[PDB]
């Protein structure tokens, strides 16, 4: 401990604008449990849902690239090619988007694209995966620094089952403790973290109770029975993560190709299985499901603005030393 050093950091904090520049980066986060459906570029409603500018960074997570009943890199690459074609298709003049990196754990995959113009700012990209224990479930994560701000993205597919939310909570803990990038870096060591996917948490009511409530728009009532909300409220899972209020209907269990909830004999209770949660000072904007019908789940997305800082380290070290000396001499004089 050094009092003079503390003093300097305190003062310097007041003069940050002298060695720091701040910028807002737009980030589009998209999630889709595919039920093993084929890759296609017909995703416009999902990836360009709003009448707003294209994002700087697109973070796309898929579950069940192979329908669940050994990891297919080929199928993941078809999706990569489809997303890239779609993003560049909107870039009629000049530079488009490039894939920074992708990762995969069995049927779960995460791929991140950014504008070519963002590339010079992106550094220390790392990726890792972690399977769940208590198998085809788990997480895929990619992190990177954008100038001097650290971001970490995680997509997952957690334990399936109507009542086994204790196993999903266990999966959360397994992944939060188990995901490690280079040199033991954890997911929490970042300014912004977005963790999302098919967490599989369910609404704890019966099919016959839930369906008419959905049809009647009683989403607030149903959310009172959502297992994820219940476990987050107690700090048991995803502590310090936030979720925007859900204004869209349960994204799971639909007959494929239709607006109809599961009419199979399995009469699966609808649920908000697909979620996007964030930790850190992101500014959230949208959070919605989109009407694509290729799977028994609807895809979802969330948008954010992320404040980025670029620090002139050289210029800051100089001010620091100057302020530090000035203060040490001041204390010297006071002793005289
Ligand atoms: O594979 P799907 O289409 O997601 O269907 C799953 C099903 O496979 C079981 O894992 C299950 O039942 P259980 O109640 O016995 O845990 C769960 O409720 C269903 O939603
Ligand atoms: Ca499925």
Swiss-Prot record:
Residue runs in coiled coils: none
Family to which the UniProt record says this protein belongs: Belongs to the synaptojanin family.
Protein purpose: Controls the cellular levels and subcellular distribution of phosphatidylinositol 3-phosphate and phosphatidylinositol 4,5-bisphosphate. Involved in distinct membrane trafficking and signal transduction pathways. Highly active against a range of soluble and lipid inositol phosphates. Active in dephosphorylating the 5-position of Ins(1,4,5)P3 and Ins(1,3,4,5)P4 and to a lesser extent Ins(1,4,5,6)P4. The enzyme is also active against PI(4,5)P2 presented in sonicated vesicles and Triton mixed micelles, and somewhat less active against PI(3,5)P2 in unilamellar vesicles.
Protein name: Inositol-1,4,5-trisphosphate 5-phosphatase 1
Positions of region (Catalytic): 1-336
Cellular compartments annotated: Cytoplasm
């Amino acid at each position: 401990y050094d009092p003079i050093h503390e003093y300097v950091n305190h003062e310097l904090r007041k003069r940050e604008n002298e060695f720091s520049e701040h910028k807002n980066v737009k980030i589009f986060v998209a999630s889709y449990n595919l039920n093993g459906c084929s890759a296609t570029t017909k995703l416009e409603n999902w990836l360009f849902p709003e009448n707003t500018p294209l994002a700087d960074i697109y973070v796309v997570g898929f579950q069940e690239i192979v329908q669940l009943t050994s990891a297919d890199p080929a199928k993941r690459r078809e999706w990569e090619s489809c997303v890239k074609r779609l993003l560049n298709g909107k870039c009629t003049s000049g530079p488009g988007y490039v894939q920074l990196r992708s990762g995969q754990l069995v049927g779960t995959a995460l791929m991140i694209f950014c504008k070519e113009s963002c590339l010079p700012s992106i550094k220390n990209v790392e990726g890792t995966v972690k399977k769940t224990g208590l198998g085809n479930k788990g997480a895929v994560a990619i992190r990177f620094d954008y100038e001097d701000t650290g971001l970490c993205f995680i997509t997952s597919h957690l334990a399936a089952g109507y009542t086994n939310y204790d196993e999903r909570d266990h999966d959360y803990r397994t992944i939060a403790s188990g995901l490690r990038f280079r040199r033991g870096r954890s997911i929490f060591n970042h300014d912004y973290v977005v963790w999302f996917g098919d967490f599989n948490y369910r609404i704890s009511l019966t099919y016959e109770e839930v369906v008419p409530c959905i049809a009647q728009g009683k989403l607030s009532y149903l959310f009172e029975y959502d297992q994820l909300n219940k476990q987050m409220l107690t700090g048991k899972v995803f502590p310090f993560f936030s979720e925007l209020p859900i204004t869209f209907p349960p994204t799971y269990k639909f007959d494929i190709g239709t607006d109809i909830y599961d009419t199979s004999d399995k009469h699966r209770v609808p649920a908000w299985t697909d979620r996007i949660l964030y930790r850190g000072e992101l500014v959230p904007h949208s959070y919605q499901s989109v009407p694509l019908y290729y799977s028994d789940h609807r895809p979802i997305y969330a948008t954010y603005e992320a404040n980025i800082v670029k620090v002139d380290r050289e210029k800051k070290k100089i001010l620091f030393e100057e302020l530090y000396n000035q203060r040490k001499q001041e204390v010297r004089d006071a002793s005289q």
